[PDB]
Design a protein around this ligand. Structure first.
Ligand SMILES: O=C(Nc1ccon1)c1cccc(Cl)c1
Length: 460
């Protein structure tokens, strides 16, 4: 029974509006409705993993698990196993997997982050799950960010707090936040970004939606504009949106957007918006393809419509050789030539690197680099040919070319990371000097770059 080199992953996000769901929600898990939808010919083919994020969820865990499992069994005739479930207030994540995957899944972590302070602490935040699927690390975040059209900067702050403080994945990756811990990270939820057009334009917006003309609305979507300005979700992907705004609907129909201010809304307008989103970030040169991104049309208990996204994701085996794991395989090596970091910092500490990878027995600390002044007022840290030769546990190119090296640049004075990035070993050639590059981030914001050359020796 061979180990897979690809799986499919379903991501769902639904703000349930504190109401129980209707009796049938299968259209969600089938990726049917509006947008990029799934072909009918796939309806009986189960996804490998289903990840369900809810917000304003009124159900108990037991109640929602029974609905989800009975839904999937009706679609697929498969009884899914529960990998994890975690709830913060009314924000919930459920991970279900095909029973054949049960002994491929390990290292299951859950965590939550509560956002805000005083007034604004008590209902917004995020839940997450991570695990290993054979050789591949997977992370999932469901966040309910701050509401309201004039609070985009709050939402961006909520995002930074969640990625800083959510504790998922391998704790030995101490310099790295969740945006670097996983082969594939999926971040979804009621992100609550709005279409920023004047209140007076509400009926104009509604008209546009009825004509399926979304371009002049998407050009004002706050998530797209904040991402384009590098204010949030740096280095994440999102599929093109081709479905109508998923908020705010009159309940029990989808014929009406309920946008006008009411006491129940704090006298705020809710112009039609794409509140409900799925984004992802995968390591460089790993296969990930979005195969659906859309909203259901027939689930109408909430003022939001459910959103679905599905992905093909590359996965790798749990590799064993005669040598590693448990020793190095001295037919493998990783060399860095002519490497330098460019940092936005004003500081003048010396810096050193750490190299982290599950292809190493443990992380590797470099010597301090040589600081120079860049022409345009930057710090350039030169490592030259001074960097330690990395000794992978396995030399087989079928394993080693699929790996990645995480890099942190740390202050000698504080041991704090000033920037994190990732280099793929999926090279065009072995035993050949080749350019490498990663941006560097800290707390998910750009802090610099790392570039140089690599030389990879495998057993072939
Ligand atoms: O123990 C598991 N899941 C849960 C969640 C709540 O209680 N048990 C588990 C462990 C490994 C693989 C799988 Cl498919 C499931």
């Amino acid at each position: 029974q061979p180990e897979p080199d690809m799986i499919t992953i379903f991501i769902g996000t639904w703000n349930m509006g504190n109401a129980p769901p209707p009796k049938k929600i299968t259209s969600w898990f089938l990726s049917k409705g509006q947008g990029k939808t799934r072909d009918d010919s796939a309806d009986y083919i189960p996804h490998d993993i289903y990840v369900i994020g809810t917000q304003e969820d009124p159900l108990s865990e037991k109640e929602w698990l029974e609905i989800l499992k009975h839904s999937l069994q009706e679609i697929t005739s498969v009884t899914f196993k529960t990998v994890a479930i975690h709830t913060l207030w009314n924000i919930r994540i459920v991970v279900l997997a095909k029973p054949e995957h049960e002994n491929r899944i390990s290292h299951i972590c859950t965590d939550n982050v509560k956002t805000g302070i005083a007034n604004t602490l008590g209902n917004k935040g995020a839940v997450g799950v991570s695990f290993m699927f054979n050789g591949t690390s997977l992370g999932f975040v469901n966040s309910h960010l701050t509401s309201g059209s004039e609070k985009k900067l709050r939402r961006n702050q909520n995002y930074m707090n969640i990625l800083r403080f959510l504790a998922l994945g391998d704790k030995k990756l101490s310099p790295f936040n969740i945006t670097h811990r996983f082969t594939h990270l999926f971040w979804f939820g009621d992100l609550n970004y709005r279409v920023d057009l004047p209140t007076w334009e509400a009926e104009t917006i509604i008209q546009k939606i009825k004509q399926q003309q979304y371009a002049d609305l998407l050009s004002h979507d706050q998530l797209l504009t904040e991402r384009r300005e590098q204010k949030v979700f740096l280095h994440f992907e999102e599929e093109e949106i081709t479905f109508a705004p998923t908020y705010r609907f009159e309940r029990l129909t989808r014929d009406k957007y309920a946008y006008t201010k009411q006491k129940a809304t704090g006298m705020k307008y809710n112009l039609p918006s794409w509140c409900d989103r799925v984004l992802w970030k995968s390591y460089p040169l790993v296969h990930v393809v979005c195969q659906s991104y859309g909203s259901t049309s027939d689930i109408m208990t909430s003022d939001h419509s459910p959103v679905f996204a599905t992905f093909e994701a590359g996965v790798t085996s749990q590799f064993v050789s005669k040598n590693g794991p448990g020793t190095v395989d001295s037919q493998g090596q990783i060399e860095f030539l002519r490497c330098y970091a460019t940092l936005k910092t004003k500081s003048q500490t010396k810096f050193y690197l750490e190299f982290h990878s599950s292809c190493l027995e443990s992380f590797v600390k470099s010597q301090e680099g040589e600081n120079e002044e860049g022409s345009e007022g930057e710090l350039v840290v030169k490592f030259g040919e001074t960097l330690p030769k990395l000794k992978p546990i396995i030399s087989d190119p079928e394993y080693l070319l699929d790996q990645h090296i995480l890099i942190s640049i740390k202050s000698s004075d504080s041991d704090e990371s000033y920037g994190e990035g990732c280099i793929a070993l999926r090279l065009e050639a072995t035993e050949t000097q080749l350019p490498i590059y990663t941006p560097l981030t800290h707390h998910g914001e750009l802090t610099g770059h790392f570039q140089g050359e690599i030389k990879l020796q495998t057993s072939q």
